[PDB]
Design a protein around this motif. Structure first.
Motif, short mmCIF file in Angstrom:
data_model
loop_
_atom_site.label_atom_id
_atom_site.label_comp_id
_atom_site.label_asym_id
_atom_site.label_seq_id
_atom_site.Cartn_x
_atom_site.Cartn_y
_atom_site.Cartn_z
N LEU A 48 -16.60 -42.04 -13.49
CA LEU A 48 -17.16 -41.71 -14.84
C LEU A 48 -17.44 -40.22 -14.97
N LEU A 49 -17.65 -39.76 -16.20
CA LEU A 49 -17.91 -38.35 -16.47
C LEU A 49 -18.84 -37.70 -15.46
N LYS A 50 -18.25 -37.10 -14.43
CA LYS A 50 -18.98 -36.42 -13.38
C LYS A 50 -18.31 -35.10 -13.06
N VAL A 51 -17.02 -35.00 -13.38
CA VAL A 51 -16.27 -33.79 -13.11
C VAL A 51 -15.33 -33.42 -14.26
N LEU A 52 -15.86 -32.70 -15.24
CA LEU A 52 -15.08 -32.26 -16.39
C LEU A 52 -15.92 -31.46 -17.37
N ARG A 53 -15.34 -30.38 -17.90
CA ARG A 53 -16.03 -29.51 -18.84
C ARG A 53 -15.54 -29.69 -20.27
N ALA A 54 -15.37 -28.57 -20.97
CA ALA A 54 -14.91 -28.57 -22.35
C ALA A 54 -13.63 -29.37 -22.53
N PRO A 55 -13.57 -30.20 -23.58
CA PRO A 55 -12.39 -31.03 -23.87
C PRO A 55 -11.12 -30.19 -23.95
N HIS A 56 -11.17 -29.12 -24.74
CA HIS A 56 -10.03 -28.23 -24.90
C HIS A 56 -10.38 -27.04 -25.78
N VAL A 57 -9.36 -26.28 -26.18
CA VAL A 57 -9.57 -25.11 -27.02
C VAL A 57 -8.66 -25.20 -28.25
N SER A 58 -8.45 -24.07 -28.92
CA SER A 58 -7.61 -24.02 -30.11
C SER A 58 -6.12 -24.12 -29.77
N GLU A 59 -5.30 -23.33 -30.45
CA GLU A 59 -3.86 -23.33 -30.23
C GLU A 59 -3.49 -23.02 -28.79
N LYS A 60 -3.24 -24.08 -28.02
CA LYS A 60 -2.86 -23.99 -26.61
C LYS A 60 -3.03 -25.38 -26.03
N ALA A 61 -4.26 -25.89 -26.12
CA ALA A 61 -4.59 -27.22 -25.63
C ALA A 61 -4.60 -28.15 -26.84
N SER A 62 -4.29 -27.58 -28.00
CA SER A 62 -4.25 -28.33 -29.25
C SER A 62 -2.82 -28.72 -29.57
N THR A 63 -1.87 -27.89 -29.17
CA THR A 63 -0.45 -28.16 -29.41
C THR A 63 -0.12 -29.51 -28.79
N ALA A 64 -0.88 -29.88 -27.76
CA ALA A 64 -0.70 -31.15 -27.08
C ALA A 64 -1.68 -32.15 -27.69
N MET A 65 -1.61 -33.40 -27.25
CA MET A 65 -2.48 -34.45 -27.76
C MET A 65 -2.17 -34.79 -29.21
N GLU A 66 -1.48 -33.89 -29.90
CA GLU A 66 -1.12 -34.10 -31.30
C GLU A 66 -0.43 -35.45 -31.47
N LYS A 67 0.84 -35.52 -31.08
CA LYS A 67 1.62 -36.74 -31.17
C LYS A 67 2.23 -37.02 -29.80
N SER A 68 2.43 -35.96 -29.03
CA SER A 68 3.00 -36.08 -27.69
C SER A 68 1.92 -36.56 -26.72
N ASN A 69 2.12 -37.75 -26.17
CA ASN A 69 1.17 -38.34 -25.23
C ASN A 69 0.77 -37.37 -24.12
N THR A 70 -0.32 -36.66 -24.33
CA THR A 70 -0.84 -35.70 -23.36
C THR A 70 -2.27 -35.34 -23.72
N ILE A 71 -3.08 -35.01 -22.72
CA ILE A 71 -4.48 -34.65 -22.95
C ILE A 71 -4.94 -33.52 -22.04
N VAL A 72 -5.70 -32.59 -22.60
CA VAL A 72 -6.23 -31.46 -21.86
C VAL A 72 -7.74 -31.63 -21.74
N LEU A 73 -8.31 -31.17 -20.63
CA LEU A 73 -9.75 -31.28 -20.41
C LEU A 73 -10.15 -30.57 -19.13
N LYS A 74 -11.04 -29.58 -19.26
CA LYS A 74 -11.51 -28.81 -18.11
C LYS A 74 -12.30 -29.70 -17.16
#
Lengths: 60, 99, 92
Positions: free
Chosen positions: C1-27
């Motif tokens: 469970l949430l024990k190791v992870l920071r900010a979900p993502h940022v603007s244009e960079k980690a946003s280009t993903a997760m849109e429709k292309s099955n992918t997720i960014v997370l610090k």
RNA sequence: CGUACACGGUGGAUGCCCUGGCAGUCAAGGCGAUGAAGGACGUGCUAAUCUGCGAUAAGCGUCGGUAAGGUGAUAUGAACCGUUUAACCGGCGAUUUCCGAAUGGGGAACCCCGAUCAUUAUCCAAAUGAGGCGAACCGGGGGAACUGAAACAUCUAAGUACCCCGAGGAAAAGAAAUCAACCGAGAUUCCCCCAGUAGCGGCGAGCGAACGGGGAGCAGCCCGAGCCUAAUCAGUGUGUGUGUUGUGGAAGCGUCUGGAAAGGCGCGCGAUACAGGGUGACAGCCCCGUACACAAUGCACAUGCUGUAGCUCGAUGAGUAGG
RNA sequence: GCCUGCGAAGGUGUGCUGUGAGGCAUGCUGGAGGUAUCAGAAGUGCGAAUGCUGACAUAAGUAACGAUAAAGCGGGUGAAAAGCCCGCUCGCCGGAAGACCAAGGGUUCCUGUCCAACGUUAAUCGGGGCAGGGUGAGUCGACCCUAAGGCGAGGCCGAAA
């Protein structure tokens, strides 16, 4: 929660608590996402709790 | 000595005769009593000295020399406020010599 | 469970993903090996995890003249999607 | 532009102060493969350092003390905790990731396992030891030179510097085939003296005891047999004299100067307690502290006690004495 | 046995005394303590080691900036612009001041806000100061192994790293 409370709890109670606190240890993590209701008190307190119970678990 | 949980009575300063509790004591020897304050610009009830400048400390800056707590001598001062859970301190408080 | 992870993502960079292309960014923290980032996410994120990749990183001392530079940064991981739902929300 | 001075600056001496050193004294005195010392690197909301810890990271738990103030040095902003009595102080317990003398192997901290020697050996590492560290001191070995002799090969500096191995908190020595003023002393070291004498020496320069005496400290005993039980051994119980903190703790007095006295002046006081520091300027009678008192721990050296257990007889060590 | 915030020591200038080495007084300042007698004391009284250390003057506002010798004319912005930016014109380099890289250095890269410090001038410029952002590979490199050679273990040598 204080050490006195954890000691009184049963082996299963400490497990359900560690797990409850484990499940609990999830909700938070949202500040970087832009949250507010996130409290700094339990931020540091919860890690101690899941640990305190973890220490007594071995003491048993 | 002087404590924060005690009341003081001025005797020299222009605030002579004013009564109040000790706000706080600094390692400087000065003591600010609840009452001896000054009127700031925008008229804000805040204790401070009377002198022009930018940012300066608060407190009216009273001195333990002109104050009046429990002086073992003949003066014009009167009653003064003073822990209790100590027990031994209660005996001294009961004596008309100390507190 | 949430024990190791920071900010979900940022603007244009980690946003280009997760849109429709099955992918997720997370610090995430640095001490995070491969054990987690699959056991902190995917758990309640309402989704099972995709080819999972849990990266790690850290800089090094120096940088200045006499001081305590010694350090160890911290490292997000790319988590594409098993084919299911985009963490319930965050996305297109 | 010469020289003196004035005002201001540069500069930093000097005067005063100083949370620092230097030196002496008392007490106390080891750590680790249950993996220490040290180092690396984390950890406080912000913290770059230092310190404390170490991923329950300047913290967690218990008991006792203590106390309302507290959240290390930085007295900041934000903010938290405390009477479900914290902070702080003392002791103890729990936990204590990975790497790390680690030894599986390699390796500038990263990846997989009891490596090596050795004893016992159910020869299965199965049960154990060694392999490291530490201020000096101590014991057993190896062993210079420059220098001095105003040259130098003996001699001298040296049996020192340095090197090898090892123990303890203390070691080494030691119960006399000794000493030798004597119908005597009489285990061994150490201190003083005896001696700078005897002795040694191109007897040149230099080198240099001991016996004894006066002291400190005192303990004597074991290796073939017979016999029987209080040496010894094994085990058990387990100290008197304490360690830190808190409690029983008097005390701004007067006048003058000043923003303030720990000033001047006047008066009084403590003392089986006549150190020092702090408090707005030189307060032993403001606060702490000094003599003192009490409680928490470690050490508890010893003693007591159980089972062992006296005592008796003979001898006494040859490749040694000696050459 | 005395002096002192009706103010001392020290410092500057000045008066007096002693043969002198010095004492002492006044004014300013300082503004915290400082002496005389007799007595003992000290790591005790000093311009002259190419002396040691720090500071400073005269010298000097004197010496120096040179094959990739290129800037110039208008305009823009700005409180300031001869070297910040735009246009044109005029040139330099071509194994080279071009392009891609090793070692090494190391964030110095990019954006925004500034410049006190750095840039042998100035700077609204910067590889400068501050705050953020950036280096998302199974097939690139590390990781793995090996050559000259080296190390540890057993064997053999007063002893041994």
């Amino acid at each position: 929660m204080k050490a006195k409370e954890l000691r009184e709890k049963s082996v299963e109670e400490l497990n359900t608590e560690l797990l409850n606190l484990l499940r609990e240890q999830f909700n938070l993590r949202m500040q970087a996402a832009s949250g507010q209701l996130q409290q700094s008190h339990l931020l540091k307190q919860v890690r101690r709790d899941v640990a305190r119970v973890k220490t007594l678990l071995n003491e048993k | 000595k002087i404590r924060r949980d005690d009341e003081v009575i001025v005797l020299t300063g222009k605030d002579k005769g004013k009564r109040g509790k000790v706000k706080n004591v600094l390692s400087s020897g000065k003591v600010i009593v609840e009452g001896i304050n000054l009127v700031k610009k925008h008229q804000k009830p805040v204790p401070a000295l009377n002198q022009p400048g930018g940012i300066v400390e608060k407190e009216a800056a009273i001195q333990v020399s002109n104050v009046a707590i429990f002086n073992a001598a003949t003066g014009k001062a009167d009653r003064v406020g003073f822990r209790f859970e100590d027990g031994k301190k209660v005996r001294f408080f009961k004596s008309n010599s100390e507190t | 469970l949430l024990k190791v992870l920071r900010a979900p993502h940022v603007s244009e960079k980690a946003s280009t993903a997760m849109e429709k292309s099955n992918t997720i960014v997370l610090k995430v923290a640095k001490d995070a090996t491969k054990a987690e980032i699959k056991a902190a996410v995917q758990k309640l994120f309402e989704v099972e995890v995709e080819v999972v990749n849990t990266l790690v990183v850290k800089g090094k001392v120096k940088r200045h003249g006499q001081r305590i530079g010694r350090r160890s940064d911290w490292k997000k991981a790319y988590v594409t999607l098993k084919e299911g739902q985009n963490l319930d929300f965050v996305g297109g």
